[PDB]
Specification:
Length: 130
């Protein structure tokens, strides 16, 4: 599924993402936007280490979900990577929360650091009623 901006914002808010560990909704939106263009079936293979980025938040199988094909990997979110490819983003949100429960917080995603950190992200939620 490819979410429309405000559609995703309300969806994320309903799933309890607004302020989760101090992270505003606009940050989560800026992340999903640059990570997958709001596409839940987005995937990006990394030939370098054989891992794959899954879903709307491009969560990596080397560490977060199990897909059984990375020679040496862990499954910190305790989910099959398939779970991160559903139109329903609840499981992906549960994993996204798990990622930020670690020290870096929202900084886990390099894309967030380069394209959202210290930026005006209001644009991502304006007019969405969130």
């Amino acid at each position: 599924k490819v979410f429309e901006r405000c559609e995703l914002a309300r969806t994320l808010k309903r799933l309890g993402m607004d302020g989760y560990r101090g992270i505003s909704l606009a940050n989560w939106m800026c992340l999903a936007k640059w990570e997958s263009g709001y596409n839940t079936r987005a995937t990006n293979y990394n030939a370098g280490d054989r891992s794959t980025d899954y879903g709307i938040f491009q969560i990596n199988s080397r560490y977060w979900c199990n897909d059984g094909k990375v020679p040496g990997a862990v499954n910190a979110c305790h989910l099959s990577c398939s779970a991160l490819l559903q139109d329903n983003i609840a499981d992906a949100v549960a994993c996204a929360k798990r990622v930020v429960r670690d020290p870096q917080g929202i900084r886990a995603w390099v894309a967030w650091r380069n394209r959202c950190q210290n930026r005006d992200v209001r644009q991502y939620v304006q007019g969405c009623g969130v």
